[PDB]
Amino acid sequence: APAAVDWRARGAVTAVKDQGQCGSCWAFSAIGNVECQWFLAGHPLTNLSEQMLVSCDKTDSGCSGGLMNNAFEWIVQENNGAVYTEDSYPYASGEGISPPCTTSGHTVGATITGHVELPQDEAQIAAWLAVNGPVAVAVDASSWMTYTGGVMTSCVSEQLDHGVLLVGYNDSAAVPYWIIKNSWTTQWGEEGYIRIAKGSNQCLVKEEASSAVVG
Ligand SMILES: *CC(=O)[C@H](C)NC(=O)[C@H](CCCNC(N)N)NC(=O)OCc1ccccc1
């Protein structure tokens, strides 16, 4: 809070998951952010369900993509603020199809009351993150299929196409960076994670930053 913050070292982040063939990155970003926010509201870290959004959120488009802000407003406005546990509504997409929504046989693992959209400014996004926790962001991920590790320092920044989770930053590094949780298993990047240079809107990281609010 300045200097460096890694929310992984504060027990606030669940393991890296796998979206597979589904275009559900939006749901991973939105849920990942909720999981962290719920913990930080003084609740035990619980794995929550992306499948609930992919199959039940009809404000977005399942395996064809969607937006984290729409998912946040669907939870509040349509699902009474409920977020089911991953355990009671396990990921069933992956082959690239979303089975139909089942409205019962699930347990509420978390509830949100709304969401805030953060300024398009990295210094301000970092200020909020430092105190309030992980933020969901949209990024141009064009370069990311060849990311093997290290802090990227140069990234194609032409079109926002992927949703991810910002879990920290370190401005004490030789090149300050952001640390991002991705959803392409642990086999990609630094054990599922990516580090990009902070301060130059790499991969357009400041353009659509938002977060769920609990309580
Ligand atoms: C990461 C993915 O899995 C896929 C296939 N794409 C999406 O989820 C993108 C991510 C966000 C990209 N661009 C932004 N400006 N945020 N979503 C997408 O393009 O969603 C579109 C959409 C819009 C309105 C209603 C339904 C769907």
UniProtKB/Swiss-Prot annotation:
Result of changing T186A: In clone 1800-2
Residues bearing carbohydrate: N47, N170
Disulfide bonds: C22-C63, C56-C101, C155-C203
Lineage: superkingdom: Eukaryota
Stated consequence of mutating V164L: In strain: RA
Its biological purpose: Hydrolyzes chromogenic peptides at the carboxyl Arg or Lys; requires at least one more amino acid, preferably Arg, Phe, Val or Leu, between the terminal Arg or Lys and the amino-blocking group. The cysteine protease may play an important role in the development and differentiation of the parasites at several stages of their life cycle.
Protein name per Swiss-Prot or TrEMBL: Cruzipain
